[PDB]
């Protein structure tokens, strides 16, 4: 499946015919049925990473939001992702915001979304993952782990209890869990990144996680915004260390609108993803790595659409990367593209593998 054909004919046509939410629903459907380009790239040993208690056959994952309800996991591995993250999942089903709630900014290679945690809920996702639980166990053992990203319901009183319920229900079924406190589309949610709120929330999450039988006990990561103050970042790093949080996902979408955006839809409310987020996210990785002394694994995400973009985040401190918005524009071939370019650049820059490149900018 040609990189050129998808980039220059297929994705532009689908974009010309369908609004972005319809296009995404069709993509989830096709992916869930395995109707994808092959994909030929075979992962070399230079791309394997060991982190979070697992082997990852390659460091390129699908970011949360694409497969919100765990419907397409196997088709995402078939696409060539080293790991798959589903969600965000909320405790109770909820519809999210009214449509339209997602917008393309093609001149910016960006998207703005305001889905507001549309979710089938924990029970539905639980059963969906349970139907393939041993298939995933084998995938995980073969180097293809599964992450589950947890959110909170719009009308929930007690946010921490929403996250605890998620840990209890889906934790067993996940190699890692993500406490998503950085959606910009749920009122008040990002205030959970504040020191006191985060410590209270994560103490409860970790207690529930530690209460799970050893074989079912996932790593716990916290996904953070790209819009944090210095004080916020220092506070997060402190809490992450005080509690022994397994890792950080850096970053969610931005509420900022960087100067220079050209898309007609630039002033729509929501989080902005894609190329204009890229270096903001990279910078946030760099800072969090330094504040955590390189001892806390980071999954780097925001604006990755090439091997260079991947390597930049790796060298800034990410152990793994994810992408979401690049797919919208370039389609499935972009996965093998990132990986082939990443391997080439690692060789060019004198790294024996991804592992050797993690945090390399900090040792220069
Ligand atoms: C349409 C859309 C929906 C998303 N929904 C979620 C979500 O449910 N949970 C989450 O943690 N992040 C979500 N994200 C954020 C992505 O996981 C990722 O952090 C962000 O888009 C940056 O990566 P990208 O520039 O490669 O898209 C969403 C992103 C987009 C574009
Ligand atoms: C008419 O629609 C199609 O032919 C589509 C679609 N959609 C086809 S034909 C063969 C094929 O790979 N697709 C296809 C295109 C995009 C995507 C896709 C788009 C966005 C994604 O976000 C991460 C992930 C996958 C998935 C697909 F499975
Ligand atoms: O609106 C959502 O559901 C969603 C959007 C997004 O950009 N990030 C997130 O965590 N949730």
Curated annotation (Swiss-Prot):
Q: Note whether Transit peptide occurs among the keywords.
A: yes
Under Enzyme Commission nomenclature, its number is 1.3.5.2
Reaction catalyzed? (S)-dihydroorotate + a quinone = orotate + a quinol
Question: What is the protein's major site of localization?
Answer: mitochondrion
Q: Which InterPro entries match?
A: Aldolase_TIM (IPR013785), DHO_dehydrogenase (IPR050074), Dihydroorotate_DH_2 (IPR005719), Dihydroorotate_DH_cat (IPR005720), Dihydroorotate_DH_CS (IPR001295)
Pfam families for this protein: DHO_dh (PF01180)
Keyword Membrane listed? The answer is yes
Role this protein plays: Catalyzes the conversion of dihydroorotate to orotate with quinone as electron acceptor. Required for UMP biosynthesis via de novo pathway.
Associated disorder:
Postaxial acrofacial dysostosis: An autosomal recessive syndrome characterized by severe micrognathia, cleft lip and/or palate, hypoplasia or aplasia of the posterior elements of the limbs, coloboma of the eyelids and supernumerary nipples.
* Name of the protein: Dihydroorotate dehydrogenase (quinone), mitochondrial
Organism, per UniProt? Homo sapiens
């Amino acid at each position: 499946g040609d990189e050129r054909f998808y980039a220059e004919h297929l994705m532009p046509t689908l974009q010309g015919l369908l609004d972005p939410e319809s296009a995404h629903r069709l993509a989830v459907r096709f992916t869930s049925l395995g109707l994808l380009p092959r994909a030929r790239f075979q992962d070399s040993d230079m791309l394997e990473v060991r982190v979070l208690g697992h082997k990852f056959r390659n460091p390129v994952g699908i970011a949360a939001g694409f497969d919100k309800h765990g419907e397409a996991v196997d088709g995402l591995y078939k696409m060539g992702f080293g790991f798959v993250e589903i969600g965000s999942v909320t405790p109770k089903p909820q519809e999210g915001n009214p449509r339209p709630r997602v917008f393309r900014l093609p001149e910016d290679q960006a998207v703005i979304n305001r889905y507001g945690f549309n979710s089938h809920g924990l029970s539905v996702v639980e059963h969906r993952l349970r139907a393939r639980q041993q298939k995933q166990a084998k995938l995980t053992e073969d180097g293809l782990p599964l992450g589950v990203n947890l959110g909170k319901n719009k009308t929930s009183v007690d946010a921490a209890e929403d996250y605890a319920e998620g840990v209890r229900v889906l934790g067993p079924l996940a190699d890692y869990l993500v406490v998503n406190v950085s959606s910009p589309n749920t009122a008040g949610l990002r205030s959970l990144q504040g020191k006191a709120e985060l410590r209270r929330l994560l103490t409860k999450v970790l207690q529930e996680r530690d209460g799970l039988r050893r074989v079912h006990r996932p790593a716990v990561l916290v996904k953070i915004a790209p819009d944090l103050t210095s004080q916020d970042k220092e506070d997060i790093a402190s809490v992450v260390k005080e509690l022994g949080i397994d890792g950080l996902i850096v970053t969610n979408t931005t509420v900022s609108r960087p100067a220079g955006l050209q898309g007609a839809l630039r002033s729509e409310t929501g989080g902005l993803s894609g190329k204009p987020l890229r270096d903001l996210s990279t910078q946030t990785i760099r800072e969090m790595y330094a504040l955590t002394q390189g001892r806390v694994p980071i999954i780097g995400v925001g604006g990755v659409s090439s091997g260079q973009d991947a390597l930049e985040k790796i060298r800034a401190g990410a152990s793994l990367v994810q992408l979401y918005t690049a797919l919208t524009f370039w389609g499935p071939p972009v996965v093998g593209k990132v990986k082939r370019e990443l391997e080439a650049l690692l060789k060019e820059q004198g790294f024996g593998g991804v592992t050797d490149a993690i945090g390399a900018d900090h040792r220069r």
